[PDB]
């Protein structure tokens, strides 16, 4: 049976600070061989292009297989020694594939003062 | 910036289903022949950006550098640090033809990889709706 | 060189989907005796509920303690989402040999934060 | 309500480190390999959560389950439930760890509160049974489980 054509982007938040905060970013697209995501902080600044211990560390799942009607890909973003100024950056996580990118972003002092 | 990611063993095919391949003078050309697609993450993502190569003992990589198609001799590097290389294409998908994709240059916005015939010679080429010439398929495992 | 740490923590997706998944990860050093799960409302597990109400929980086992904690999970499951279940307080509970720890949340109030 | 979830192989000792074990006459009681001395603990979810709602059962036993029924030790012939619809049950205990000590276990019953396990002397027996707890840092009330 034809499979479903789907393409998402989705993060999962904590909806509370901890000493290490971690945000998941799943991926959902029918090209299962070219599809991944992954993060910007900010506006243009992917993890690798930051200051060396700036608390931001990403980590791409790989070896990760598609399933039969969509490749999964996911990657984490990992908040440790939480400045104010992360409170407030901008998160954005990117599907790419041979279509246009989809984005998803997020900033966790909103969320965790939606409350 | 250009961040190498994941990459693929892929056949690529033109419209008539023309196998890409490269001859022994480094010809990249249409016959009736195994490339490396590396995908990369992009601080200013416009698509998908991958670069071709050569699945060879050789380092061969594709580049449309001076709005000409060759393929240089190197391994696609683990970072880029520029908003565009010569080296890096645009992977796009025809709209209504998932099935389909086009390969736009990241240096030269409006140029795509083609198919053209010489004179008893098909080969992959450089040029500036529908155009079937700048539309393949990607083979994968 | 075990510290001891204690905690339940929540992770939502940032926008509703068609299926809707949230992640309740416990923290307990009782690594025999520490486990996780979900309360609907007031008092209701998603046992008590009506079937087919469209909450699935999936509680991890054979999950086995790490050294110095126990790390026990309880994935929370939304399909055919209804607004009562959009406004509705979803609570994960850790339960050890110390009082229960609970984090709760209502997802439209997450969803509806706008910046 | 009470939903079970895992179970546990465990071992029980009282403060002396005597195990706790049943007779040919189902006595629990506390002794100085053996079927009777193994037990499983298992854990329940609840509605209404006060702590760690368990049963205690025998592991070898076809059905052998502690209970608190009248305020006495008993093992009904029973096997513990997948779930029990009430906000207290006879054979459900409230497994909380001693404050300072949380090696050290007690059971509060969940029908009869303020009533916990003890280990308890009569004659050169040492049983089984269930008390009032009053005043603290009784070390009668208090256990070690194994596993």
Same mark, same amino acid.
């Given at each position: 049976?034809?499979?479903?054509?789907?393409?998402?982007?989705?993060?999962?938040?904590?909806?509370?600070?901890?000493?290490?905060?971690?945000?998941?970013?799943?991926?959902?697209?029918?090209?299962?061989?070219?599809?991944?995501?992954?993060?910007?902080?900010?506006?243009?600044? &992917?993890?690798?292009?930051?200051? #060396?211990?700036?608390?931001?560390? +990403?980590?791409?799942? @790989?070896? !990760?297989?598609?399933?039969?009607?969509?490749?999964?890909?996911?990657?984490?973003?990992?908040?440790?020694?939480?400045?104010?100024?992360?409170?407030?950056?901008?998160? &954005?996580?990117?599907?790419?594939? #041979?279509?246009?990118?989809?984005? +998803?972003?997020?900033? @966790?002092? !909103?969320?965790?003062?939606?409350? | 910036?250009?961040?190498?990611?994941?990459?693929?063993?892929?056949?690529?095919?033109?419209?008539?289903?023309?196998?890409?391949?490269?001859?022994?003078?480094?010809?990249?050309?249409?016959?009736?022949?195994?490339?490396?697609?590396?995908?990369?993450?992009?601080?200013?993502?416009?698509?998908?950006?991958?670069?071709?190569?050569?699945?060879?003992?050789?380092?061969?990589?594709?580049?449309?550098?001076?709005?000409?198609?060759?393929?240089?001799?190197?391994?696609?590097?683990?970072?880029?640090?520029?908003?565009?290389?010569?080296?890096?294409?645009?992977?796009?998908?025809?709209?209504?033809?998932?099935?389909?994709?086009?390969?736009?240059?990241?240096?030269?916005?409006?140029?795509?990889?083609?198919?053209?015939?010489?004179?008893?010679?098909?080969?992959?080429?450089?040029?500036?709706?529908?155009?079937?010439?700048?539309?393949?398929?990607?083979?994968?495992?």
């Amino acid at each position: 049976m034809e499979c479903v054509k789907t393409r998402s982007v989705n993060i999962h938040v904590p909806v509370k600070e901890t000493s290490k905060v971690v945000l998941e970013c799943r991926g959902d697209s029918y090209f299962r061989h070219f599809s991944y995501v992954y993060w910007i902080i900010g506006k243009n600044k &992917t993890v690798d292009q930051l200051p #060396p211990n700036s608390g931001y560390r +990403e980590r791409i799942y @790989l070896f !990760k297989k598609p399933h039969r009607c969509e490749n999964r890909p996911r990657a984490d973003l990992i908040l440790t020694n939480i400045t104010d100024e992360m409170r407030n950056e901008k998160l &954005t996580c990117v599907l790419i594939d #041979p279509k246009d990118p989809l984005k +998803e972003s997020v900033i @966790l002092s !909103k969320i965790w003062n939606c409350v | 910036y250009f961040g190498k990611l994941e990459s693929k063993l892929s056949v690529i095919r033109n419209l008539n289903d023309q196998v890409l391949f490269i001859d022994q003078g480094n010809r990249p050309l249409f016959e009736d022949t195994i490339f490396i697609i590396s995908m990369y993450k992009d601080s200013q993502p416009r698509g998908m950006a991958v670069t071709i190569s050569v699945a060879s003992a050789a380092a061969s990589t594709l580049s449309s550098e001076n709005k000409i198609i060759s393929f240089k001799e190197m391994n696609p590097p683990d970072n880029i640090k520029d908003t565009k290389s010569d080296i890096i294409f645009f992977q796009r998908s025809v709209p209504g033809h998932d099935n389909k994709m086009q390969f736009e240059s990241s240096s030269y916005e409006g140029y795509f990889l083609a198919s053209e015939k010489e004179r008893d010679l098909f080969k992959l080429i450089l040029k500036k709706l529908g155009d079937r010439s700048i539309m393949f398929t990607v083979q994968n495992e």
